[PDB]
Amino acid sequence: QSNRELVVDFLSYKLSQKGYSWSQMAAVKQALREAGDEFELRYRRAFSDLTSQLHITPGTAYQSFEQVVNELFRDGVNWGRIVAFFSFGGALCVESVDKEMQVLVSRIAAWMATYLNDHLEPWIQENGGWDTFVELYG
Amino acid sequence: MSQSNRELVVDFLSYKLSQKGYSWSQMAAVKQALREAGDEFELRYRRAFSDLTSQLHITPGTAYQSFEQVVNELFRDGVNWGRIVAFFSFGGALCVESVDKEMQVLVSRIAAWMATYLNDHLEPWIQENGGWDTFVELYG
């Protein structure tokens, strides 16, 4: 419940500041958050290109999110392209709130979970899983 | 495994929104305001915080009664948001000390002590002072 989630969240944070972690799941979350910030800093110019090639409206269809993201994996999966996929989704959500349509955020989140579980999870499983991501780029 | 992936999506998106001054949900907004409050506390009161972190010696045997005895001291004169933040900072420093000393099992014990102390001793004041929602208003 509420108080428990607050405790876990705060402790995960304080631990992460010293390079430690609350749980394997927290370690994955924190590593992904961190890889995203670093991706966005290292590829700032390119980040812009990817995010200005999709305007989200309440009209845009999933199949169209899918074909943009497909362009990103035009070279097949690696961990960095997966991080880029998360950053792309994140930038979509931010633009949606900028444009006063935070109601789109939950749809984008569903789209991301769909793409992840359909296309990407089978690769992730084959490549050591998220725990392996943490070992490499955590 | 897709529940995991879903959780990951939400976590990442909550993070990116928070960086632009937005929030995934109210609970996410409290989470961020409390993290940031703890950072600012530890910065503004670093000397008292630092001394406290050099004075930490816990063992796998330490009991919840002892922890409750220590934070009772923090709250002797009353509860306020500030001391609640200090309580969280305290817990975090305990966990970091436990891991420093390779006592991983103490980490989940401490979490439960904190939740127990919050639910039992702090929740009434929190509810009577406007809920975490009011914390976010004041210090978010």
Ligand SMILES: CN(C)CC[C@H](CSc1ccccc1)Nc1ccc(S(=O)(=O)NC(=O)c2ccc(N3CCN(Cc4cccc(-c5ccccc5)c4)CC3)cc2)cc1[N+](=O)[O-]
């Ligand atoms: C701990 N710290 C100090 C170090 C962390 C370290 C660096 S921080 C980072 C994070 C993510 C990616 C890259 C770097 N971490 C890291 C390092 C390496 C890998 S990795 O080796 O696995 N990957 C890459 O190095 C890599 C992956 C993707 C990259 N971009 C950059 C450009 N962007 C443009 C783009 C947009 C749209 C379409 C196309 C397109 C269309 C059609 C055809 C082709 C392309 C192209 C596409 C994706 C660029 C590099 C993965 C990770 N990591 O996961 O953390």
Ligand SMILES: CN(C)CC[C@H](CSc1ccccc1)Nc1ccc(S(=O)(=O)NC(=O)c2ccc(N3CCN(Cc4cccc(-c5ccccc5)c4)CC3)cc2)cc1[N+](=O)[O-]
């Ligand atoms: C948004 N931004 C830009 C500004 C946010 C602003 C400042 S940032 C902050 C955060 C927390 C506390 C104080 C300041 N925010 C804020 C401001 C005011 C309040 S307030 O008016 O309500 N309160 C206090 O001002 C206040 C409360 C308690 C204070 N001290 C300092 C003395 N110190 C002794 C100590 C130190 C360390 C550990 C223990 C300890 C721990 C466990 C066991 C035994 C001992 C004991 C603990 C208690 C000191 C000040 C609460 C909050 N706020 O919630 O954010």
Ligand SMILES: [Cl-]
């Ligand atoms: Cl103690």
